[PDB]
């Protein structure tokens, strides 16, 4: 049968305006091109002059001249060596070759999480092979992730953890040990030595991009040696039992270097193993008492917990992150498991950190609690300014939007619509702990992913998170990228809500900033499924404007009138429903 295989570029792609040919590879040799127009879709005129080239299976066409911002089809007639006639097109859209120009200070931040839990294992070993070595990796792609509009990397935990080369990085064995000593087994930790991961931070900073550690700061494994520990009789599991603890951490590798502390049973509140009886349970230590947390009795969660009350072990802890940001070079942190730790101490540490230096140290809290009242509640419990928060309630509404949900309610979703706390949100689609494999948590954003993005890229509170796994394992890279450039170019200016969202549509407008030409967007995102386009009536905020829509989906222009308002569009799909119409000049 006559069919198409591919073509470069495929259907749907953005491209250069610097673009040469196009290549349409058929499945059969193709012995005749009867037919073929590049047509100027906005226009309805065909390009003249346009030349082909065929070569057995493969037509090559060439000679044409693309206009930046322009929606092109392709439309072809082929005969093949079989007599077979095939009628077929490709859509294509191309790039802007003069974007806004938005003050160095102004432009807008994102955060790519640049791991996921996978990574070197399994099949993703032998299909991105490249990942074998992800510090190396980040230096190596730092100059492509500037261009993507990217402005900070939060980096998977670097120190040394109990799996050794195996550890994602969250079981703490030593945060002193950033691949640099033989310990667990290796001197890399998962992710490369330090010198790599000095190298990257050097490279990334290169081009402009900040780096955040992962400071796992609730617990301790991987322990030097056991110890016989008498539990209090206020312990919910033993209680006024010994049992044998495995709390003994002195770093031989390391020798010592950099801190001298050395943790035993006295720096930890409790554990939930005995290795006497090979019974898990909650022991917390005599004497010991659980740290102060948002939710009553939430200090415990695995491993050896840390005591958080103990001077000493603030002493080193505060020391560490001092280190790490005016030492080290890194720019902020994201604070694992930040509802299981003293608030007292996440205050106290966060405060002694961003007073060691002039950098305006970042701080994110992962605090996972889903509803928004709750979430304000722990931010105003811990009490201290820097902190933000990833956006849990947010994501509960993409989770919503799987099999559908009351589109209209995102006006209201999330912390970054909650009045006060908007710009503590750092908002999120999927990560690590949601989108896994195996053992996942939660259920993935496995349907309307991209309008979850789309949602929170071109928003003007909080701070924006792109996974990985979403961005390169999962190949929504050429889709993304769009959504970059509209963040990275248009979403700026104040932010209006619109009046006619509904059940299956939700809109949304940034004006732009009144001294910069060209910036400004607004957004249609649906979760309909009827295949239809659907148009809304919006206040655009910019009279008499031609916009485009930068994802490519709905080949046509808008014009507004003289009271900004315009008829934007987009395509009632999973797949396609969303899109940014953004000035064409
Ligand atoms: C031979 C050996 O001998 C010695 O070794 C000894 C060791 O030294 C000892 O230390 C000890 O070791 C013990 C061992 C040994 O195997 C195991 C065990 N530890 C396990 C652990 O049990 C296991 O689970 C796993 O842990 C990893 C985890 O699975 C991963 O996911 C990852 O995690 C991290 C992380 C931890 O750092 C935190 C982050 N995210 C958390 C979040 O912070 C947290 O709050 C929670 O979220 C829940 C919400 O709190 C909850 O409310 C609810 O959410 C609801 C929401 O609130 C509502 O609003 C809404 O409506 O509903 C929501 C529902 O979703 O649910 C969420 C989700 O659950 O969890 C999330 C995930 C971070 O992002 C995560 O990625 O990493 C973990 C660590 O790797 O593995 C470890 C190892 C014991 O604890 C440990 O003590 O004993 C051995 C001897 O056996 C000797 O030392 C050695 O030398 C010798 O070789
Ligand atoms: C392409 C696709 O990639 C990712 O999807 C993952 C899921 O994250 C992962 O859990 C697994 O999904 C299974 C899921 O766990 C299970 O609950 C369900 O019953 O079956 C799923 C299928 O195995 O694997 C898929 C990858 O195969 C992203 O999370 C998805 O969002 C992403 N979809 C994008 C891409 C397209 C394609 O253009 C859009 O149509 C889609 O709406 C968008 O969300
Ligand atoms: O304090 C360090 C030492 O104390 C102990 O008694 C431990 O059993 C031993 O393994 C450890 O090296
Ligand atoms: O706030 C968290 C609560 O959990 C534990 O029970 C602590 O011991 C108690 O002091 C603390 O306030
Ligand atoms: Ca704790
Ligand atoms: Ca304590
Ligand atoms: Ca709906
Ligand atoms: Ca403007
Ligand atoms: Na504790």
Redesign the pocket.
Known sequence: SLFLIESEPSTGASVSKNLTEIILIFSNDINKVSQLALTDLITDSDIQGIDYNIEGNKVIINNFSLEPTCNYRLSYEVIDIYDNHLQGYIEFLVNQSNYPQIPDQEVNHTILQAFYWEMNTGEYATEHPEEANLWNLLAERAPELAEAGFTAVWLPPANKGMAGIHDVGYGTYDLWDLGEFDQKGTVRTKYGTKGELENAIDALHNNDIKVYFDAVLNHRMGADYAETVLLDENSRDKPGQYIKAWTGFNFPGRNGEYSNFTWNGQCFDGTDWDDYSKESGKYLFDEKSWDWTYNWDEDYLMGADVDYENEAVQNDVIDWGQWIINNIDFDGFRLDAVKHIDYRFIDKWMSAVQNSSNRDVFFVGEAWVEDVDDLKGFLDTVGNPDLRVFDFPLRSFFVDMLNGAYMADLRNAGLVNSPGYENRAVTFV?NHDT???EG?YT?????????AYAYILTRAEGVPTVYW??YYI???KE?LDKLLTARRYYAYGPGYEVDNNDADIYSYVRSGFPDVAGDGLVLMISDGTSGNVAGKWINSRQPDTEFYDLTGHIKEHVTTDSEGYGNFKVIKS??KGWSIWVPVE
């Not at 259920?443 to 309008?451: D, F, L, P, T, W």
């Open positions: 999927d989108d896994r494999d996942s259920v993935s954003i496995y349907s309307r992913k991209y309008q796994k979403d999962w190949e929504m889709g999973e797949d």
